[PDB]
Every structure is written in structure tokens, then in C-alpha cells.
């Protein structure tokens, strides 16, 4: 009884404090600067050989090698410079949802509808690849397990729970709770101390690895959240939702700054990404296209076309030289 | 270049292995099994598996029972299966609207607009006993039952009451009304009557898959 009244009073106080510190807007300050114009990109390489749709991808740390995962139970490693296959690993379970690449290039991980994110070893004396460890402590399906170091990994599953693992012993150490719907994505800070997540209850949270407590919460959307990415500076991020919108949040103010919305667009967004200098924004849509937005002006500039089915992954190299996309027709392309 | 020609050799070998793998992959049919509790789904047969073979043809069947009750996110994976098997219990009148609602929700999806459905009406023996003895009515739950007549296409079993036939065909028409209302000609529905001790259940799936493939092929030559 009194709990709901106290919650309402606290929410009113928080909203008053948050709205009491807004003087101007971002669009009112960057009016004087000139726009970027028009940018056109042409595909350079096309990679073929997969049997079914592609669900995930990841770039290497040297921006030459990349890995891909397919629904037929395969995990191939490519050489983007010369389009040469280096490895081909068969999976025990056909349903796979994610993949990762270690920073040092010695391990590869994957997981899916089997509630397990496995670890593979790439440099062995016998000359082949083999499973090094298996982790099983989750209930629902697994949507993202992302490396943090050579000895620890961060995983988010579909039972509204995130955890921090220990590869050496296989036992989890820290558990994060607080969401209501299942978690769909996460991103890591450049210093590897903080990370964010987006669930299916239209909210996002900022966690602390060392302690294990929530810091602050941002809510400005209206539907489920499908993707999230971090600003190169380390003090902002962008999210993609199911109502065809993107928003930019500021950590130091706990308010949204701009909305990237346009008419005659009625499809959701599956993935977002930034650039090396943080001046452009790329987003993949369900209408078989890809758009490039202007971060400081929120107006479209350039389109990427050529796919014949919905896109499902998107990434940018560490040195900022190429973009790679994968779709549901099992073709990978590199733009420049 | 002596160390870069061997890389091309290795890549060609890997590609030739994938070529062998494709032929094995392409010659197998997958099936998805759905339903609810108290339906005898397990009697007919976070991931299960079951492989059976008929006339030197391989079939794969999956069952999902390790997740929560929210199925609007992991159901997009099964968008390229051959067919979907739906199991209902046609002997309890208190839980028919739920089955109808899930059937409608599955049928009217956007990523599953080219997938056919094979429908099993399980537990056909308890319904006859319930109607013959007599302790509950049907017009109390469905008011439309008071103006139903058996269609001329009926094929009653030898030596059975016509009331049971009317009850069976009303329940079948309830699903057929939804099935034949939003079809553009890309997928259909195959009704069936199933008992708890029947022995011929793989042949029905065999024939239904054959019919699905034949219709799909005939459609695109402007012959259908």
C-alpha cells in the first residue's frame, strides 16, 4: 500500500530533478558548423561458402581475420585480404546464436539454444582444434557471450540474468540481477570496467564489474531494444529499437539528447555501429537496406544496397578502414 | 609465393570437403513439434531429438521444453523447416479457446507465412464416452452448436452414433474456419483424426510431405 505511494513520490522527485537541469539542446549548439555532404561506398569483396543463414560475426584484433557463425553448424575463419579459408570447425548443436574472438587470437567461443557457451583452442601441438571447456549454469537460451580477458568472459542469457565466469575452474563468481525481460545485447567499455545491457522491457542499465551493483537507469523508448553500441570517447551510447528509432544518451546528465527518426520507414533495427572519430552512425534495417546517419545533425547521407534479405550483423575494423555485413542469404560483403 | 600457393591448395581442399557436406545436408527433412500439456504429445513420440526412417528416407523432429513461456523471440529460428506439427486434446471443453488462440497467433505471423501445418486431433476415444454417458453440454460454452448440421462429405465410422460425428466435425470446422480465411495460396492445413493406440502415424507425415512438395512444384509452372 504505502510502497506504491513512496515509489510514486520518488519517481516524481527524480523526474523533477532530471528536468530541472535542462537549459539548451544539442541541435541548438551545432548549427554553425558545415555538413559532411554525400558519401558513396562500393563493395570490394564477397565471401561465399556457407550453407544457411548467418547469425553473428566478429573482427580480429589485427583487422585481417574474421569469424562467422551459421545455422547449419559451422564456424569458418576467413582471410579478408585474399579470401582464403584458414579453419572449419563443426559444431555439436545446429542452433547457434553468437560468436566471439579473443583479443590475443588464441581462443574462440560460441553458444546458442543449448544454454552453453563453449571455448575452443586454436594453437595445439596435434594440429587440430578441440573443445577446451564447457560452462553450464544458465536456464534459458544464450544470446551473447563476450570475451574480457584470456581467463574470464561475460555472458548474458534469456532468463533475465547476466554473470561473470572463470575459465580456469568453470565456476561463476558474480551475478547481476534487476531486469524483467530477457537480455538481448551488451557492450564493453574501452577500459573494461563498465558495461551496459538492453532488455525486452524498454530499459537499459549501467553495471559495475568490481562491485556488482546497478549505477543508474535510462528509459526513453517505447518497445523492445535489439542492439546497443558504445561511443569511442566513453561517455555516450546509442540504441536501436523495434519502433524504427535511434537515440543518444549522455552518462553525465542521465537524459537523451537527439532522436534519429524519419518518415516512410516502418521496420525495426537489428544492429548499430560507430566510426573511428565518432562522426557517423550506421544502422541495419529489416527492409534489406542499410543507412548512414550524421551524428551531429541527424540527417541521412548515403545508402548501402545490395543485399536481398534482412541484415543481421554489422561491424567496423579497429583502424577504421572497412565495414562488413552479413544477411540471411548467407553472403558476406566488405564495403570501402 | 612458394608459401602462398600451399594456402590456396588447403583452401581448395576445404571447399571440396564442404561440397561433400552439402549433399548430405540437403537430403534430410526437418520437422518441428508443438503443443501444450495434458495433450499426449510425448506419447506419440533445452532441446530434444528423435530420428525415424520410412522407406529409406530420413526425418528429424525437435521438441523444445527447456525455456520459459515467452516464445516471440526464439521462434524466428524455425523459419525454414518443412512443416509444423500441432497437437491438441479434443476431449476437454474448458481449454479449447486457448488452443484456438495459439493456432491463430501462429498462423497469422509474419516470418512464418510460407509454412504448412499438420494438425492432429488426439484423444478421440474419451470424447465418445463423454457424449454417450452425458454429464456436460457444449452449447453452454459455444452457443453456435445449436444450429449445426452434418455436411454431406461426412464419412462416419462403421457402427457409431451420429451425435459423436456431429461433435467431431464441429470441432474440425472450428479450426478450418480460421485456416481458410487468411490463406493467399502459399500454405494449407491437413486435418487428421488420431487415437491413443494408433500404429500408423509416420505414413501420414510421409504422404503430407509428398503432397506439400508436389503442390509447391506444380504452383510455379503456371499449372496450378
Amino acid at each position: 500500500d504505502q510502497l506504491r505511494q513512496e515509489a510514486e513520490q520518488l519517481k516524481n522527485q527524480i523526474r523533477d530533478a532530471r528536468k530541472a537541469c535542462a537549459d539548451a539542446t544539442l541541435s541548438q549548439i551545432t548549427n554553425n558548423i558545415d555538413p559532411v555532404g554525400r558519401i558513396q561506398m562500393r563493395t570490394r569483396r564477397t565471401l561465399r561458402g556457407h550453407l544457411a543463414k548467418i547469425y553473428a560475426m566478429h573482427w580480429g584484433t589485427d583487422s585481417r581475420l574474421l569469424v562467422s557463425a551459421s545455422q547449419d553448424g559451422k564456424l569458418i575463419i576467413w582471410d579478408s585480404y585474399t579470401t582464403n579459408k584458414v579453419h572449419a570447425i563443426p559444431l555439436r548443436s545446429s542452433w547457434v546464436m553468437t560468436c566471439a574472438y579473443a583479443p590475443s587470437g588464441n581462443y574462440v567461443a560460441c553458444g546458442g539454444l543449448d544454454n552453453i557457451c563453449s571455448i575452443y583452442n586454436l594453437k595445439t601441438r596435434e594440429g587440430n582444434v578441440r573443445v577446451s571447456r564447457e560452462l553450464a549454469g544458465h536456464t534459458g537460451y544464450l544470446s551473447c557471450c563476450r570475451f574480457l580477458d584470456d581467463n574470464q568472459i561475460v555472458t548474458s542469457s534469456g532468463d533475465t540474468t547476466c554473470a561473470l565466469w572463470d575459465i580456469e575452474t568453470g565456476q561463476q563468481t558474480t551475478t547481476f540481477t534487476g531486469h524483467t525481460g530477457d537480455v538481448m545485447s551488451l557492450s564493453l567499455a574501452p577500459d573494461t570496467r563498465l558495461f551496459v545491457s538492453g532488455a525486452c522491457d524498454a530499459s537499459a542499465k549501467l553495471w559495475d564489474v568490481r562491485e556488482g551493483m546497478c549505477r543508474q537507469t535510462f528509459t526513453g523508448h517505447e518497445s523492445d531494444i535489439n542492439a546497443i553500441c558504445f561511443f569511442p570517447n566513453g561517455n555516450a551510447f546509442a540504441t536501436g529499437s523495434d519502433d524504427a528509432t535511434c537515440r543518444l544518451f549522455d552518462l553525465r546528465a542521465d537524459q537523451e539528447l537527439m532522436t534519429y527518426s524519419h518518415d516512410n520507414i516502418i521496420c525495426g533495427i537489428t544492429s548499430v555501429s560507430f566510426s573511428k572519430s565518432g562522426r557517423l552512425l550506421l544502422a541495419g534495417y529489416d527492409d534489406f537496406n542499410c543507412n548512414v546517419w550524421d551524428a551531429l545533425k541527424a540527417d541521412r547521407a548515403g545508402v548501402l544496397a545490395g543485399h536481398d534479405n534482412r541484415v543481421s550483423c554489422l561491424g567496423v575494423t579497429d583502424d577504421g578502414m572497412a565495414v562488413a555485413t552479413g544477411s540471411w542469404d548467407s553472403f558476406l560483403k566488405i564495403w570501402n | 609465393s612458394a608459401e602462398d600457393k600451399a594456402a590456396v591448395e588447403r583452401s581448395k581442399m576445404i571447399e571440396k570437403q564442404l561440397q561433400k557436406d552439402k549433399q548430405v545436408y540437403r537430403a534430410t527433412h526437418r520437422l518441428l513439434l508443438l503443443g501444450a500439456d495434458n495433450s499426449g504429445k510425448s506419447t506419440i513420440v533445452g532441446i530434444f531429438e528423435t530420428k525415424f526412417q520410412v522407406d529409406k528416407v530420413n526425418f528429424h523432429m525437435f521438441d523444445v521444453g527447456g525455456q520459459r513461456d515467452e516464445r516471440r523471440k526464439w521462434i524466428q529460428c524455425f523459419n525454414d523447416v518443412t512443416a509444423i506439427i500441432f497437437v491438441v486434446d479434443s476431449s476437454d471443453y474448458n481449454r479449447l479457446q486457448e488452443a484456438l488462440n495459439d493456432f491463430k497467433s501462429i498462423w497469422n505471423n509474419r516470418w512464418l507465412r510460407t509454412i504448412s501445418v499438420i494438425l492432429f486431433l488426439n484423444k478421440q476415444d474419451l470424447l465418445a464416452e463423454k457424449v454417450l454417458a452425458g454429464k456436460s453440454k457444449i452449447e453452454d460454452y459455444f452457443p453456435e452448436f445449436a444450429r449445426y448440421t452434418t455436411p454431406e462429405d461426412a464419412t462416419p465410422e462403421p457402427g457409431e452414433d451420429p451425435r459423436v460425428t456431429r461433435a467431431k466435425y464441429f470441432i474440425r470446422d472450428e479450426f478450418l474456419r480460421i485456416s481458410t480465411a487468411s490463406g493467399d495460396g502459399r500454405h494449407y492445413c491437413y486435418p487428421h483424426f488420431t487415437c491413443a493406440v494408433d500404429t500408423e502415424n509416420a505414413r501420414r507425415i510421409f504422404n503430407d510431405c509428398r503432397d506439400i512438395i508436389q503442390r509447391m512444384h506444380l504452383r510455379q509452372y503456371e499449372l496450378l
Partner: nanobody
Amino acid sequence: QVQLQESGGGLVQPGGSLRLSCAASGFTFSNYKMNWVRQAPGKGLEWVSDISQSGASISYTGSVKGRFTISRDNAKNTLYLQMNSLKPEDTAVYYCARCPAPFTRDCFDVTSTTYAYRGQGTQVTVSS
């Protein structure tokens, strides 16, 4: 933030009429589908009614036909339910739910307390 409210409950004798309201805020009310869901005292949640975006796609359940009416007012973001000639078996709690995504023809609302877009509920007593 998605927020919904309920009002219009009370204690009534067998035979009468009363109304309900579902005030909506925080989103575009004209691009979504609306439902009414009721759970019995001890049973699970049960579907009751429905209404679409345009205004004419009304549907009901078998046990309430001829006694319940559902309408919406797009100019004020309000959902209504007019019910009369009640029976002693209707002593449950009602909710006001919405489908997840816009411009859709399907939604999955009946879930064991794990659905985020739903109201708080109101109490209705008809036996006494």
C-alpha cells in the same frame, strides 16, 4: 515510460451495470491493438475481448456474447468496457494489456506475470 491505469470497480448485486476505464500514456495510442484480460480467483489468466486500431475488428469470447461491449476513443487515449446483466460467477480481476509491436496482426499477452506492458488491475465483486 509505458503506464496504464484502471478504475471502475465496486460491489454489486446479481443484475446491474458498471463501467471500466484504461487511461494510456507514454506512447502513440493510435498505432497499437488493445485487449482485455481477466484472471479468476485461483485460476490462470483468460482472454476476454479485443479491439483494433481502426475501430471495427471487434471480437469476443463465447461466454460473454450478447452482454459485453468494448470501444475506444482515439482522441483522448482511453479504453472502455460496458458490461451489464452480470452473473455470480464473474468475481475476478481485470487488466488492460497491449500487443508488443505496432502494425502487427498477432500478439502474446497471456503470460504468468512476466509481461511488462500491463496494468495493475481492479477488483470486482458481484456475489454480495
